[PDB]
Structure 1
Amino acid sequence: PLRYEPNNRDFACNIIDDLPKLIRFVKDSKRINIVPYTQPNSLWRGPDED
C-alpha cells in the first residue's frame, strides 16, 4: 500500500483526475450500449467497497 501524504514541497499536481474518465462501447443483442470504462484488470484491483 502506497502512502502519499500531502507535502508542500511536492508541487506535482495531477490533471488526469480533473479530466473526465473514459467510457466503453459494448454492444449487446438488442442494441449498442455505453458503459463506464474499467481496466481489464481493475475488477480485482478496484478500490474495495469493504
Structure 2
Amino acid sequence: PLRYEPNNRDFACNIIDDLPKLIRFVKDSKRINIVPYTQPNSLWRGPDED
C-alpha cells in the first residue's frame, strides 16, 4: 500500500481525477446499453468496501 501524504513541496497536482471518467459501450440482446468504465483487472484491485 502506497502512502502519498500531502506535502507542500509537492506541486504535482493531478488533473485526471478532474477530467470525468470514461464509460464503456456494451450491447445486450434487447438494445445497446452504456455502463461506467471499469478496468479489466480493477475488479480484484478496486478499493475494497472493507
Which of the five TM-score ranges fits, normalised by the shorter chain? over 0.9
TM-score w.r.t. the length of structure 2 is: 0.98
Q: Distance in 1 between matches of 2:29 and 2:44?
A: 27
Q: Distance in 1 between matches of 2:29 and 2:48?
A: 31
* Structure 2 unmatched runs, 5+: none
1:1-50 matches, within 5 Å, as 1-50=1-50
Identity of aligned residues (%): 100
After the TM superposition, which segments of 4 or more aligned residues of structure 1 sit over 6 Å from their partners? none
* Structure 1 unmatched runs, 5+: none
TM-score w.r.t. the length of structure 1 is: 0.98
> RMSD value over aligned CA atoms?
0.3
